[PDB]
Amino acid sequence: SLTNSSLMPTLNPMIQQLALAIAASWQSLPLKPYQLPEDLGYVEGRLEGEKLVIENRCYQTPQFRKMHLELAKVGKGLDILHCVMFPEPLYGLPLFGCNIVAGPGGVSAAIADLSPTQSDRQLPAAYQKSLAELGQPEFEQQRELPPWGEIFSEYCLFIRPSNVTEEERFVQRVVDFLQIHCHQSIVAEPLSEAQTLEHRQGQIHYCQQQQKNDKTRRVLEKAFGEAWAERYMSQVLFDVI
Numbered sequence: 001s002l003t004n005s006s007l008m009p010t011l012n013p014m015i016q017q018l019a020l021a022i023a024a025s026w027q028s029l030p031l032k033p034y035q036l037p038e039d040l041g042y043v044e045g046r047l048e049g050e051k052l053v054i055e056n057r058c059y060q061t062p063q064f065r066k067m068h069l070e071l072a073k074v075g076k077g078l079d080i081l082h083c084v085m086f087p088e089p090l091y092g093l094p095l096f097g098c099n100i101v102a103g104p105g106g107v108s109a110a111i112a113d114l115s116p117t118q119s120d121r122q123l124p125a126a127y128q129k130s131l132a133e134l135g136q137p138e139f140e141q142q143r144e145l146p147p148w149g150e151i152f153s154e155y156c157l158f159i160r161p162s163n164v165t166e167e168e169r170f171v172q173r174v175v176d177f178l179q180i181h182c183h184q185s186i187v188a189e190p191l192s193e194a195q196t197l198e199h200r201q202g203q204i205h206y207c208q209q210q211q212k213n214d215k216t217r218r219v220l221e222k223a224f225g226e227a228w229a230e231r232y233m234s235q236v237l238f239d240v241i
């Protein structure tokens with residue numbers, strides 16, 4: 001639960017709403033804690049510039065090997081939400097991820113996806129069908145994915161929200177993605193060893209590509225330095241199984 005968070009009250013309102021929605025989706029699942037390296041939960045650091053504060057919450061279920069919700073703030077202005085649900089490869093589910101970045105003048109980036117793990121880069125058919133039924137969402141300011149973003153599905157949303165209506169529409173789309181994903185997790189069957197290996201590789205590739213994101217790395221380096229940032233990206237955020 002988030003009522004004991006020290007960062008929550010100080011974060012951009014869209015981030016607060018989305019954090020609450022993710023927590024509500026997870027709250028009644030068969031959750032167990034997942035221990036991050038060094039049992040990390042709150043961390044703060046500074047070098048010569050602004051302080052970075054991070055709060056981490058992490059869990060697992062039989063179908064999701066690691067469910068990570070991270071809230072962060074740089075200085076007074078830069079607010080971040082990071083969330084990934086890493087699937088257990090045995091069940092073949094896609095990777096849910098989202099990131100919101102906001103400053104004093106509003107949300108600059110809102111990204112969410114259900115990303116594929118199959119070698120053909122397609123989502124399972126049940127997901128394709130359910131996602132197609134939601135309809136194409138209308139947003140005024142779409143952003144093009146960076147080159148390492150070939151890991152994202154055709155349903156990936158990457159926008160700068162233009163107004164509160166778009167903020168709310170984006171949050172609702174993430175809730176819809178999570179409703180689909182949690183339902184599919186109930187009906188998922190354990191796969192063969194060969195198919196498990198295929199899904200494992202797709203997850204490894206997703207993690208290696210996400211480690212190429214210099215926008216994350218520079219924020220971490222400015223507060224903690226190069227070696228800490230590399231450890232954090234490779235062992236805490238995007239760990240290879």
Ligand SMILES: C=CC1=C(C)/C(=C/c2[nH]c(Cc3[nH]c(/C=C4\NC(=O)C(C)=C4C=C)c(C)c3CCC(=O)O)c(CCC(=O)O)c2C)NC1=O
Pocket residue numbers: 070072080081082083084097098099101108109111112113145146149158213215216217219220
């Ligand atoms: C400590 C955690 C953390 C930090 C410091 C972070 C920083 C961060 N991530 C992004 C962009 C940012 N983030 C993502 C996407 C993601 N990033 C993810 O971690 C996940 C799970 C996704 C997608 C599901 C993209 C694709 C981009 C745009 C990169 C670019 O423009 O080069 C920016 C630039 C925002 C803008 O251009 O408006 C910043 C400062 N993101 C974080 O999550």
Ligand code: NA
Pocket residue numbers: 140141162
């Ligand atoms: Na506009």
